[PDB]
C-alpha cells in the first residue's frame, strides 16, 4: 500500500457524525436567525475571491466533525504522497503528478530515479515556440498560406479540457479559429471540416497510444480529407501529435519534431495542463496558457499548505461527503453564472465521476457505502430557466455550487447586475424558501377567494433547505479559471482519500471496449448474428437490415 487505507465508516468521527445527524435538524432559516455571525464564520475570503459555504446544512459541531473525519483518514499524509510523487495509483503502479505540470520548476520531483521538471519545461517550451510560429503566420501550409483553423482530435481527457478551456477563455483568443472533433460518429468531423480549407487547416491528433480507435478513425478521415488537396509529403506541415508512440506517429506522416510528449503520471482527465493543452496554447497564446497554469499552481499551494478549516478544496470535499453519505443525496449540481463556463459542468463529469465512480476500496474490498455522486449542470441563467423547477419543488435533495464573477469581460448596459441579481436570489430562494403564511398573504393580495387560496397554497410553497456554496471571483481570466479547475481537482482528491478508493485509475472502461471489439467484425459481414444474448442479437440484426 501507498496511501493509507482507512475505512471511513470505521472511524470515530464517522460514528459521531452519524449520531449528530440523527439527533439534529439542520434548518437554514433557523441557523441564520440564531447567529448573525454565520456568514463571517462559514466563509473564506482569499484576495479577490470569496468562497461562502454558510448556506450548507451544517452547524459548528457538524463542521468540526467533518474536519475530524478528514484528519482521521490521514488526509495530510495523502496530500504529501501525491505532491511528492509516491506511487499512489496502486492498481497501475504509477505516480499522480498533474500538480508537477504547473509547478514551474519550483520543486524537483523524482520519478523512476529521474527528476521530471526538465521534461515538463522542455515540452512547455516546445509548445511555446510552435504556437508562436503558427500564430505569427511564419509556419505556412502546403500552398504558402498562413494557418487559420486548428482542429483538435481526441476523446475523453484529450477533448473535454481543451473544449472547456477554449470556450471559457474566448475573450482572450488569438486570430486562430478553433474546432474540436471527438465523436467516432463520422458526422462530427464531416460537419466540422465542411467549411474549412485544407491549405489553411492544422490538425492536432491527441492520443497517448496513437491507437485509440475513435481518435485514429477521425485522424485517418482528416488525412483523407486533406489529401483531396495536399500531397502525402504535405501531411507533416499540417498535422501534429500529442503522443508517446513515436513509430506510429511517424508512420502516419507526422514529423517527429512535432510530437509533444506527456507521461503516465498525467491522467487524461487531469491532462489539459500538459502537452494535451496545445490547442489551448494556440487558441489564446502561450502567455495566457502560462497564466492558466499559474492559477492552478496558486490553488495547489493553497491546498497543500492551508489548515483544513480555511482550505477551500478540503471544505468542498467534506461537505460533499456529508450530503452523499449522511443526507443520501445522489447528485451534486454545478451552476456557473457565466456563459463562458458553458462546458464546465460537462468537464467535471469526467474529472469527478471517472475518478470516484468506484465500488472497491484501497484494500481491494467492495464498499457498502456511497462514493462519487452524479455531477451535472448548465450555466446560469440557462439552467435556471430549464430545470430549477425541480430543484425548488421536486422530491430530490440537490446540493449545488454557484459560481460567479464580479466583472464581465464584455460589459453591456445592465446585463451584469441582472445576471448577478439571479445568482444571489437563487441561493437565497433555495436556502430559505417561502412559507405557507407568506403564500396566503400574496394570494389574498392578488384578489383570490377562499376556495382558490385553499387549492393553490401548497403549489406555491417553497420548503427551502437546499444547500449551496457560492464562489465570487473578481473576473474570469486564465489565472482565475486555473484556480477554479484546480479547486475541483483537489475536492475530488479529498473525497477519494476519505472514501478509501483509487481516484486515478479507470478499470470500468475495459468491458465495453472488449465487447465492442467483438461486435465490430460482426457488423461488417452479411451473416445473421446469434452469438450474443437475444437482445444484442436482435439489435444487431435489425441494424443490418436497415444500415
Automatic annotation (TrEMBL):
The active site is at 354 (proton donor), 385, 513. It catalyses: alpha-D-glucose 6-phosphate = beta-D-fructose 6-phosphate. Pfam families: PGI. Pathway: Carbohydrate biosynthesis; gluconeogenesis; Carbohydrate degradation; glycolysis; D-glyceraldehyde 3-phosphate and glycerone phosphate from D-glucose: step 2/4. GO terms for biological process: gluconeogenesis; glucose 6-phosphate metabolic process; glycolytic process. One of its GO terms (molecular function) is monosaccharide binding. PROSITE patterns: P_GLUCOSE_ISOMERASE_1, P_GLUCOSE_ISOMERASE_2, P_GLUCOSE_ISOMERASE_3. It is found in: Cytoplasm. The keyword Glycosyltransferase does not apply. Catalyzes the reversible isomerization of glucose-6-phosphate to fructose-6-phosphate. HAMAP family: G6P_isomerase. This is Glucose-6-phosphate isomerase. It comes from Elizabethkingia anophelis NUHP1. The gene is pgi.
Amino acid at each position: 500500500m501507498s496511501l493509507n487505507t482507512i475505512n471511513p465508516t470505521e472511524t470515530k468521527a464517522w460514528a459521531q457524525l452519524k449520531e449528530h445527524f440523527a439527533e439534529t435538524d439542520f434548518d437554514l432559516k433557523q441557523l441564520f436567525t440564531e447567529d448573525k455571525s454565520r456568514f463571517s464564520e462559514f466563509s473564506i475570503q482569499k484576495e479577490n475571491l470569496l468562497f461562502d459555504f454558510s448556506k450548507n446544512l451544517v452547524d459548528k459541531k457538524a463542521f468540526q466533525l467533518l474536519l475530524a473525519l478528514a484528519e482521521e483518514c490521514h488526509l495530510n499524509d495523502a496530500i504529501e504522497k501525491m505532491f511528492t510523487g509516491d506511487l499512489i495509483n496502486q492498481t497501475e503502479n504509477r505516480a499522480v503528478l498533474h500538480t508537477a505540470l504547473r509547478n514551474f520548476g519550483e520543486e524537483k520531483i523524482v520519478v523512476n530515479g529521474k527528476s521530471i521538471d526538465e521534461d515538463v519545461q522542455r515540452v512547455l517550451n516546445q509548445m511555446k515556440i510552435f504556437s508562436e510560429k503558427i500564430i505569427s503566420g511564419e509556419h505556412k501550409g502546403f500552398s504558402g498560406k498562413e494557418i487559420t483553423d486548428v482542429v483538435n482530435i481526441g476523446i475523453g481527457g484529450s477533448d473535454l479540457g481543451p473544449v472547456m478551456v477554449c470556450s471559457a477563455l474566448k475573450h482572450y483568443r488569438t486570430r486562430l479559429n478553433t474546432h474540436f472533433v471527438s465523436n467516432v460518429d463520422g458526422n462530427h468531423i464531416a460537419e466540422v471540416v465542411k467549411n474549412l480549407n485544407p491549405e489553411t487547416t492544422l490538425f492536432i491528433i491527441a492520443s497517448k497510444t496513437f491507437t485509440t480507435q475513435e481518435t485514429m478513425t477521425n485522424a485517418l478521415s482528416a488525412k483523407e480529407w486533406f489529401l483531396k488537396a495536399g500531397k502525402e509529403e504535405d501531411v507533416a506541415k499540417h498535422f501534429v501529435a500529442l503522443s508517446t508512440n513515436i513509430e506510429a506517429v511517424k508512420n502516419f506522416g507526422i514529423a517527429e519534431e512535432n510530437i509533444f510528449e506527456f507521461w503516465d503520471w498525467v491522467g487524461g482527465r487531469y491532462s489539459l495542463w500538459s502537452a494535451i493543452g496545445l490547442s489551448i496554447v494556440l487558441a489564446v497564446g502561450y502567455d495566457n496558457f502560462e497564466k492558466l497554469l499559474r492559477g492552478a499552481q496558486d490553488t495547489d499551494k493553497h491546498f497543500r499548505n492551508t489548515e483544513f478549516k480555511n482550505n477551500i478544496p478540503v471544505l468542498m470535499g467534506v461537505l460533499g461527503v456529508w450530503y452523499r453519505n449522511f443526507f443520501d443525496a445522489s447528485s451534486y449540481a454545478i451552476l456557473p453564472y457565466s456563459q463562458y463556463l458553458d462546458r464546465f459542468a460537462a468537464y467535471l463529469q469526467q474529472g469527478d465521476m471517472e475518478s470516484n465512480g468506484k465500488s472497491v476500496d484501497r484494500n481491494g474490498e467492495f464498499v457498502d457505502y456511497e462514493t462519487g455522486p452524479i455531477i451535472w449542470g448548465e450555466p446560469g441563467t440557462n439552467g435556471q430557466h430549464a430545470f430549477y423547477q425541480l430543484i425548488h419543488q421536486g422530491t430530490e435533495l440537490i446540493p449545488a455550487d454557484f459560481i460567479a464573477y464580479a466583472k464581465a469581460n464584455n460589459n453591456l448596459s445592465d446585463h451584469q447586475d441582472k445576471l448577478m441579481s439571479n445568482f444571489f436570489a437563487q441561493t437565497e430562494a433555495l436556502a430559505f424558501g417561502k412559507t405557507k403564511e407568506q403564500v396566503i398573504t400574496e394570494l389574498k393580495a392578488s384578489g383570490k377567494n377562499e376556495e382558490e387560496i385553499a387549492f393553490l397554497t401548497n403549489f406555491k410553497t417553497f420548503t427551502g433547505n437546499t444547500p449551496t456554496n457560492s464562489f465570487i471571483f473578481e473576473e474570469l481570466t486564465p489565472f482565475t479559471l486555473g484556480q477554479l479547475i484546480a479547486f475541483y481537482e483537489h475536492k475530488i482528491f479529498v473525497q477519494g482519500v476519505i472514501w478509501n478508493i483509487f481516484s486515478f485509475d479507470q478499470w470500468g472502461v475495459e468491458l465495453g471496449k472488449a465487447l465492442a471489439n467483438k461486435i465490430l467484425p460482426e457488423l461488417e459481414n452479411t451473416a445473421e448474428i446469434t452469438s450474443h444474448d437475444s437482445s444484442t442479437n436482435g439489435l444487431i440484426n435489425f441494424y443490418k437490415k436497415h444500415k
